[PDB]
Design an enzyme around this catalytic site. Structure first.
Site, PDB file in Angstrom:
ATOM      1  N   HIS A  35       0.818  -1.218   0.000  1.00  0.00           N
ATOM      2  CA  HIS A  35       0.000   0.000   0.000  1.00  0.00           C
ATOM      3  C   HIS A  35       0.849   1.265   0.000  1.00  0.00           C
ATOM      4  CE1 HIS A  35      -3.824  -1.878   0.091  1.00  0.00           C
ATOM      5  NE2 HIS A  35      -3.630  -2.478   1.252  1.00  0.00           N
ATOM      6  N   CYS A  48      -0.149   2.189  -5.027  1.00  0.00           N
ATOM      7  CA  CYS A  48      -1.102   3.204  -5.473  1.00  0.00           C
ATOM      8  C   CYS A  48      -0.545   4.600  -5.217  1.00  0.00           C
ATOM      9  CB  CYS A  48      -2.437   3.045  -4.746  1.00  0.00           C
ATOM     10  SG  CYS A  48      -3.383   1.591  -5.229  1.00  0.00           S
TER      11      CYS A  48
END
EC number: 3.4.22.-
Lengths: 4, 364
Positions: free
Chosen positions: B78, B127
């Site tokens: 992440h 991301c």
């Protein structure tokens, strides 16, 4: 199909 | 172009406590590690790191860097991006979280430049959407113009990077295409430009994920350039435990990541006068949080290991020790032996403490  | 040395830190975060868990970082890190080793990089690969552990690991990485040294960071897990700064999110990040819980890639870059590296490569497999809860506006010092910086982002600013739901051992999308180009003897920018075009053919992600390349590299440097861990990857040696009753048990150790080791045991000798015997491992340090239902499995696959039966000796029992960086003291565990003598009725039980110190990254 699966985000980070 | 020449490298003084070539060093890589790869980190793959999956087991998030307060956020959606990931799966492919494991395979992505494993495979990039081996490709980089083919290119003669000293690689540290680490899975599932807390904030404190990620900073420790970057500190160790930075120690390995010096003038002319090529340094490469790969991160799978992440992430987000606010105001031009990319952040990597550790597995212990709260929800919601903010920049103080995360590592800012631009800070790492600045630190690497101070070591006068010959090349700085960041491959960020994460991301890059904004974090609305993180309203910190920390302006860093302007980076020096060293003309040797290359970023390969798995996705564009404000977009997501993907891996395939329910897909076993498949790579995330970025590594899927990177893997088939990494060994080319081409300037790293050109290599990434090729990956970008490969990804532009991936039907699954079109309009949602495209590689972004940023570079100020003004020399024809490549990951293949000629070079012209030490205490970080020590593995205990295979050992042959002889018990009182004569049974001998082989104990072997395999590295899967710099913080994941597989132990396996097998009977190498059973005296004629003993009819049956089993050996198993137990009483691992509580820090490693080993669940005994997950230990002593007949196959590496059953421990959740990326390793398969063909990369390890056969017909053993295997146990997966992840999170070796948490090991505060010595890796001490117990090899238990159950056996029975011909002619007797009693099951006899012996045990033996074994101490292999601090393996792999636990060594500090």
């Amino acid at each position: 199909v699966r985000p980070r | 172009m020449l490298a003084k040395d070539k060093v890589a830190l790869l980190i793959g975060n999956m087991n998030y406590r307060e956020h959606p868990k990931l799966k492919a970082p494991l395979v992505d890190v494993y495979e990039l590690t081996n490709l980089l080793r083919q290119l003669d990089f000293k690689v540290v690969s680490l899975l599932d790191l807390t904030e404190y552990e990620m900073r420790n690991a970057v500190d160790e990485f930075l120690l390995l860097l010096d003038k002319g040294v090529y340094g490469l960071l790969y991160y799978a897990g992440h992430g987000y991006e606010n105001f031009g700064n990319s952040f990597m999110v550790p597995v212990d990040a709260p929800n919601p979280y903010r920049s103080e819980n995360c590592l800012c890639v631009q800070n790492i870059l600045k630190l690497m430049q101070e070591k006068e590296t010959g090349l700085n490569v960041f491959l960020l497999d994460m991301c890059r959407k904004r974090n609305d809860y993180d309203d910190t506006i920390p302006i860093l010092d302007a980076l020096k113009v060293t003309a040797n910086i290359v970023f390969g982002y798995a996705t564009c600013q404000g977009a997501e990077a993907f891996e395939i739901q329910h897909s076993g051992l498949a790579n995330g999308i970025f590594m899927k295409f990177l893997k088939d180009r990494l060994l080319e003897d081409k300037k790293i920018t050109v290599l990434l430009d090729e990956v970008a075009e490969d990804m532009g053919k991936c039907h699954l992600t079109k309009g949602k994920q495209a590689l972004e390349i940023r570079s100020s590299l003004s020399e024809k440097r490549a990951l293949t350039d000629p070079i012209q861990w030490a205490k970080a990857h020590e593995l205990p040696e295979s050992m042959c435990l002889k018990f009182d009753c004569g049974v001998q048990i082989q104990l072997g150790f395999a590295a899967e990541f710099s913080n994941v080791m597989i132990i396996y045991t097998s009977i190498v000798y059973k005296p004629p006068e003993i009819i049956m015997c089993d050996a198993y491992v137990t009483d691992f340090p509580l820090d490693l949080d080993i669940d005994p239902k997950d230990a002593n499995k007949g196959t590496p696959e059953e421990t959740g290991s990326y390793l398969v039966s063909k990369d390890l000796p056969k017909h053993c029992l295997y146990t997966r020790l992840s999170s070796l960086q948490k090991l505060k003291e010595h890796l001490v565990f117990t090899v238990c032996l159950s056996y029975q003598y011909s002619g007797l009725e009693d099951t006899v039980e012996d045990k033996q403490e074994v101490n292999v110190g601090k393996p792999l990254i636990a060594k500090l």
